[model samples]
Target: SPVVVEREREEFVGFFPQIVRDLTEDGIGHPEVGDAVARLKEVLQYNAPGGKCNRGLTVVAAYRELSGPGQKDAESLRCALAVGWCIELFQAASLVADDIMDQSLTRRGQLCWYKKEGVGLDAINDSFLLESSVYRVLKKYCRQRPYYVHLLELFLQTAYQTELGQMLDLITAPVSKVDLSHFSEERYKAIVKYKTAFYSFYLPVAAAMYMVGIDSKEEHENAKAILLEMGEYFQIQDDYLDCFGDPALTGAVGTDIQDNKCSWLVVQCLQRVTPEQRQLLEDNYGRKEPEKVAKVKELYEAVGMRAAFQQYEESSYRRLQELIEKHSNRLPKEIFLGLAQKIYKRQK
Candidate 1:
């Protein structure tokens, strides 16, 4: 039942404090550091645990599915939950930094951490604190395991890859400049793969794979291939939703065009536009005025972008299924299939 799923989520939430303790108290047992510890606790509570927890939960779910009967003991579950929280902590750190960089106003329905009073530039240090906690959690719960180094390497590699992707994204789509020529289909795919795919879609499942001792280079590569494709599909859907999805359902209107984001929709629009139509886009693509946004949307509709997205959605779904079937031969198919099901055609 879905109630069981809710209970598992609650269990995951309950594990949050142990991680905080590992970071604040046990990890740093200095007697005069109460103020610092208190601040760390507040930072962890404010930034880490409030999301939908899909990425964190994926770790536990995949581990359970991969580890056959009797292997789901208390100790292993503890390690899995801890590693899952590590992923969430890393995400929290990235988001804190991202909000600062983007000057975003809100996240998870609250003021962005950097926007909080007394937190302006200090939030950068707090973001680093959150990142360090990931290693602390991993060391405390997983140090004795044989795959601990692999897990560390995976998280480190993911962070580097994600940072590289962010660099590409920031340079390619500066808010002050609207350079559509820089937004190629190839560059869009690269950005999505680096920025969203590795950590969101690949890391959790790969962490579970390592936990279950499925550490072959070939298998990880196979999983990465499939998960990265899924990540691309997920991001494309996000781009489509940004422009077309109902604000009521999506929680906010999309600003990709205004922000000059290298979104999938814009890439496709470039391919289909004639010279005059391109001029229309060049005039309106990144302006903040209501008429500009409306004109871009109208062009999208006139050029049949809506129809193009629909075809892409259907084709991507089918391709994901094919990849899962082909590559999941050595691994459990349900792990990949379940993740795909959760994201495909997601509304928010």
Candidate 2:
């Protein structure tokens, strides 16, 4: 049999259309709006669906812990699932726009939404619809509840936070620029924490806390500290795997160094390199040639980047453990612990 999260993931996937049909209507869906509805269907299928659904699943999984076992009440379940889909919708909004901004050609082994034939630039509006749909679903399912305002604020702020993070990343590591001088560990962590960690790591659990009536200033603040720590380490691992991870295992080759991304390795290299090594990095850092990228990797190996990462990974885990212990009384430590374990040493 599957574990709780595995089983819940199926339930989460199955419940997706409840929110979609809020726009789609019945079996013959997409009621009005003419051809736009059909396009909406395409948008939902292409942009909102797929991925690991980890972000969506986290909302439900945390609700289960916050609310308790086998908790199958209608209002609670509907709100939980709807909120999960809200996060997914929010994610799709970011991804479509990000793929365009990053000029990435493909994602999830398919053409990025912006790159699809006859669909350039227009996908921008589709991404907006995805963003709008989150609030629509929220109002449809959650507006009746006491925590409606809280949920609304959570999503809105999360979107803005993610956008702020994305802004920093874009400015610091523009595709046209290749200044290793722009990279540092502090800046790298800020970018990941804002750009990725809050939405991916903090939003889901925080939503669950709210849905389950966890509205304490102290507790939420405490939880934020731990969750953000987990989110930072999680993204650092992601940056590490982007280069060192097996493509089959990770499903996409990493483009960080090649793309002149503000990656952890680049920051660490900037920290550790000698003058000649630094010059080598400046020469080869963002070139598209295979040899240039390989040379950078060679330098990473030479400076013992892998060993440094291994040790840093260990320290992050220890710190996370301490945070969880400190805040266990406010909520279930298992909630944070389970998430930490899932991402710790994760290959993808």
Candidate 3:
């Protein structure tokens, strides 16, 4: 199974350059647009292909699982691969914009796109281009399919939901202000659900479901329930790793504390801190200084945040199992299980 997964990933990667061609040479082949095409290709190549591609692969994997073994024809498989890239393109757009908003220096072990020379604020437009390219790819590859409008609406809604989550995140944890009062379990859940869960977890599988004619309202709702919970759990692991994971493995240092991020760790710590401990956090939480960062980390340790995360992780995994069993009556449980297992104990 693992070997097949890698083969699929390789096939997926191989399909990316064609997407570039479709967007540039095929879709916008104006003589005046040659330079713009070059820039767009560079943007897509640099930003979209570096990650683990879990989200993109989920579309293909779920499509395969839903369509049954050897049931997908060559054209359908090609469309599945193309749709998978659309999800990846959507992510690339979001991450480029997110880096600018966060003032991040690096991503995927290289300079952030906006940070690259001659890119700068142009990255904002570049992100929009990347996003628009998704529709272009879909129009070229999927417009003839019966689920075209469903796919379009799903992408549009997921983008809006992610932006709403981003809005909540920005308002709650203004980088300039460190107000612990704004941090709470409820707001944290909302931020994670809308910001990360909907797009990262729900979009890919939902797209695959639409592709395979699994378009019942009840089926979509059932899938969303399970996937969003899994998405929340995945983001919790991300927050924990940001603070406690090995940088050699994670490829980036944790900055949630200094960045005033409303992370799961900080939310849980807030729940358990005493009055004096709260003061310690308020003072040290969002500062960029090494000593201040260390102080907040010490507070996390003192508040037993590590044990808290362990408990959450265990309980979350068990709960996902129960949800899958309860809701996966008409769908294949293996689809959800495969996704859950991927993130259940991921280290990087």
**For candidate 1, what is the total of clashing residue pairs?**
0
- Alpha-carbon lDDT of model 3: 0.89
Among the numbered candidates, top TM-score falls to 3
Predictions in order: lDDT: 0.87, 0.84, 0.89
Higher-lDDT candidate of 2 and 3:
3
Q: Sort the predicted structures by lDDT, highest score first.
A: 3, 1, 2
| Model 3 ranges with Cα > 4 A deviation | 27-29, 253-255, 346-348
Give the TM-score (vs. native) of candidate 1: 0.94
Cα deviation of 171 in candidate 2 (Å)? Answer: 0.5
On lDDT, the leading prediction is 3
Tens digit of per-residue lDDT, candidate 1, span 168-232: 88888876788887989888888899987999989999999999999999999889989998888
Whole-model lDDT, candidate 2?
0.84
TM-score of each: 0.94, 0.94, 0.95
